[PDB]
Design an enzyme around this catalytic site. Structure first.
Site, short mmCIF file in Angstrom:
data_model
loop_
_atom_site.label_atom_id
_atom_site.label_comp_id
_atom_site.label_asym_id
_atom_site.label_seq_id
_atom_site.Cartn_x
_atom_site.Cartn_y
_atom_site.Cartn_z
N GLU A 55 0.79 -1.22 0.00
CA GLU A 55 0.00 0.00 0.00
C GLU A 55 0.83 1.27 0.00
O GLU A 55 1.97 1.29 0.45
CB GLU A 55 -0.91 0.01 1.23
CG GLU A 55 -1.55 -1.32 1.54
CD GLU A 55 -2.50 -1.26 2.72
OE1 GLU A 55 -2.10 -0.72 3.77
OE2 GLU A 55 -3.63 -1.76 2.60
N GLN A 139 5.05 -5.97 16.53
CA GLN A 139 4.40 -4.82 17.15
C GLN A 139 4.29 -4.91 18.67
O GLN A 139 4.27 -3.88 19.35
CB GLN A 139 2.97 -4.64 16.62
CG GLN A 139 2.82 -4.53 15.11
CD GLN A 139 3.64 -3.41 14.53
OE1 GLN A 139 3.59 -2.27 15.00
NE2 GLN A 139 4.40 -3.72 13.48
N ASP A 227 -6.35 -5.10 9.31
CA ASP A 227 -6.17 -3.80 8.69
C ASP A 227 -6.40 -3.73 7.19
O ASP A 227 -5.84 -2.88 6.51
CB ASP A 227 -4.78 -3.25 9.03
CG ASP A 227 -3.67 -4.22 8.69
OD1 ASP A 227 -3.95 -5.27 8.07
OD2 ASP A 227 -2.51 -3.94 9.06
N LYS A 231 -9.58 -9.19 6.42
CA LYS A 231 -8.63 -9.42 7.50
C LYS A 231 -9.14 -8.76 8.78
O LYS A 231 -8.99 -7.55 8.96
CB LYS A 231 -7.27 -8.85 7.08
CG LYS A 231 -6.12 -9.11 8.02
CD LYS A 231 -4.81 -8.72 7.34
CE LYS A 231 -3.62 -8.87 8.25
NZ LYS A 231 -3.71 -7.90 9.36
#
Ligand SMILES: NC(=O)c1ccc[n+]([C@@H]2O[C@H](COP(=O)([O-])OP(=O)(O)OC[C@H]3O[C@@H](n4cnc5c(N)ncnc54)[C@H](O)[C@@H]3O)[C@@H](O)[C@H]2O)c1
Ligand SMILES: NC(=O)c1ccc[n+]([C@@H]2O[C@H](COP(=O)([O-])OP(=O)(O)OC[C@H]3O[C@@H](n4cnc5c(N)ncnc54)[C@H](O)[C@@H]3O)[C@@H](O)[C@H]2O)c1
Ligand SMILES: NCCC[C@H](N)C(=O)O
Ligand SMILES: NCCC[C@H](N)C(=O)O
Ligand code: NA
Ligand code: NA
Lengths: 339, 340
Positions: A55, A139, A227, A231
């Site tokens: 993206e 993360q 996200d 998903k």
């Protein structure tokens, strides 16, 4: 054009410190979100493939333009590659000149943790102390520290299908004695009695990590993992039983947990809450959900932050990405005769 | 990730040669346009400002992903800056890994000339020999050589409101003895009796560089300068007297010369002409117009070409843009302890 590569960003983050970096960034993010209507916003452009997505996330105001290139390939870890990799640019609006090219893989984890923190500060009950951390990958350490150092989280119950990921998380943060992190045998066990649930699992498919039976009055859900279309991490009914907050609605309607609900399902814009113009949490028993998917403004903020902090420290290297000032800017052909 | 900067691209282009670069690229572009249906296409995303625009141009197929960052600021030259600056990336689709980061300012001029050439080969009369070149800035030399070396153009009549730009163009290509470039004092004078009109002017506004009264039967217009909403070079009636060809229709309806025409105004997809599914030029007296605004597929092609040309020469510098393979790809936190 200045360039901040991975090792340089590592030195920058190490110098500032992960905790201060996240705290300062959250403050910067809050101010930019309050200035929401000053930005030229758009839903990021996504190019989907069989195992992932790539993206481009642009945004701009009257003086600065920013964009981030980022991929999301959950299966990458099986090949020793990161699920998420990214880099971006901060440019001058009046000339189009790219001032900074920077790695944004490390920075993405930092801005995502800072964004989650900002949202929680405004939405979670002020007496929160225990958090469930589902998904203990890249993360996770950042999310854990953001909540521990800035939202008073003292205990984290972690779960990941991969036990080695949980071991990694616990080992990485053991140095922070004020924080206890323990492994749970299941998601249901991990979320029992917690004030905040943070989900950061990676699986390019519809998933019900959190189900209605796990919800308790007063919880705040920091749903970060899902996200993109197809998903998700939350069962649709979890959203119906909570007050849902979003970043950029047009984008989140398509990529967030709310993609599972009717187009008319009511959500609240986080920036309005931060300006105190719309209600955030309405009661202590309410369940609040931050349906987080990531938004370009957050990358704009971290890029501006990184540029400022790198400049103060004299970090970064010059690169010849595009032509600078020249005697005759109309003579591009001159560059075909060799350097 | 490998990086090709401006001076490295300069050396690369110099070694390949501008004409050969354009020729080989045109061939590669033709192949990619033929497999048009194989690409995940989208209209580029633009951020407009009062003096310019900044755009991101992505495209991808099953194996490769590419995108270009590019700006268009007509007033930049007054500040000694280029109107057009660009750079881009070629990445692996199955991993998202960015393989090449490259300057694309020089490359943009090359792919634009190659695209114009490819279009002209399929749309202009095969017996063309004279071309008017309106706008003698950055793109001009590349357009000039593409047509001279690959489309038999022996004479170019050039005009630019800036006389020094024309002088620059003439001086730059004097070495090409088979090409005659002369300065005209107006657009009307420059286009009189030419076979092809190439317009590459830079003015963020609705301009009528070419008006209907300038048209002559059999002309081909390579309209390159206008490339966004509110930025055109041709009077709408010029289009009404021609067969109009486009790159990616959804995008060109918004940014091209055709933005001034009805949404139903008939246009022809260039890729279909190359595939032989629809006609290019249909008669010697017809006026054809290539309404060129630029499209990501062209940048994808030049990025792949540059990578191939750089690889066989061992050119390019390794940069740590993103993490590569690591023992534990889930331990990103380890990167916060400093490079040491
Ligand atoms: N909202 C945002 O702004 C934002 C920005 C950061 C990344 N992303 C998303 O965050 C997610 C995690 O990113 P990361 O870099 O940590 O990835 P990662 O691959 O390093 O870690 C994800 C972890 O989730 C675990 N996991 C997968 N399925 C699970 C399940 N059903 N139950 C429990 N654990 C499970 C894996 O074993 C893995 O350790 C990704 O889906 C990514 O796309 C979102
Ligand atoms: N279609 C495409 O794929 C594509 C790719 C290349 C650039 N662009 C467009 O091409 C145009 C030219 O780009 P460049 O890099 O050569 O810019 P440049 O600024 O270097 O040169 C443009 C030239 O046009 C001249 N000019 C302006 N107004 C004129 C007028 N009314 N009559 C005659 N000359 C005039 C200027 O004096 C200048 O020398 C820009 O508008 C740019 O956005 C399009
Ligand atoms: N796998 C990462 C995808 C992009 C992420 N949602 C972001 O906002 O950066
Ligand atoms: N102002 C942006 C110009 C970009 C140019 N049309 C291109 O296709 O590269
Ligand atoms: Na999410
Ligand atoms: Na044009």
């Amino acid at each position: 054009t200045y360039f901040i590569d991975v090792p340089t960003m590592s030195d920058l983050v190490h110098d500032i410190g992960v905790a201060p970096f996240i705290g300062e960034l959250a403050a910067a993010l809050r101010d930019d979100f309050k200035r929401w209507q000053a930005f030229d916003k758009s839903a990021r452009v996504a190019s989907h493939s069989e195992v992932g997505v790539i993206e481009l996330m642009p945004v701009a105001d009257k003086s600065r333009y920013a964009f981030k290139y980022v991929n999301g390939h959950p299966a990458n870890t099986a090949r020793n590659l990161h699920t998420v990799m990214a880099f971006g640019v901060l440019a001058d609006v009046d000339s189009g000149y790219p001032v900074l090219l920077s790695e944004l893989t490390i920075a993405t984890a930092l801005r995502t943790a800072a964004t989650s923190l900002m949202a929680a500060q405004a939405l979670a009950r002020p007496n929160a102390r225990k958090m469930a951390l589902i998904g203990n990958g890249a993360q996770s350490e950042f999310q854990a520290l953001a909540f521990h150092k800035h939202l008073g989280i003292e205990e984290i119950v972690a779960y990941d299908t991969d036990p080695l990921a949980t071991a990694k998380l616990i080992a990485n943060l053991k140095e922070y004695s004020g924080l206890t992190i323990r492994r749970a045998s299941s998601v249901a066990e991990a979320v029992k009695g917690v004030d905040i649930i943070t989900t950061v699992t990676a699986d390019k498919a519809y998933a019900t990590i959190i189900t209605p039976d796990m919800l308790e009055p007063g919880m705040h859900l920091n749903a970060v993992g899902g996200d993109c279309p197809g998903k998700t991490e939350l069962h649709a009914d979890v959203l119906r039983n909570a007050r849902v907050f979003v970043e950029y609605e047009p984008q989140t309607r398509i990529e967030g947990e709310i993609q599972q609900l009717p187009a008319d399902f009511p959500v609240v814009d986080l920036w309005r809450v931060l300006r105190g113009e719309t209600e955030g949490r309405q009661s202590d028993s309410q369940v609040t959900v931050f349906d987080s998917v990531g938004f370009a403004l957050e990358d704009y903020t971290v890029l501006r932050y990184v540029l400022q902090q790198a400049e103060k420290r004299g970090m970064g290297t010059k690169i010849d990405l595009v032509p600078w000032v020249e005697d005759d800017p109309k003579d591009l052909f001159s560059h075909t005769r060799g350097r």
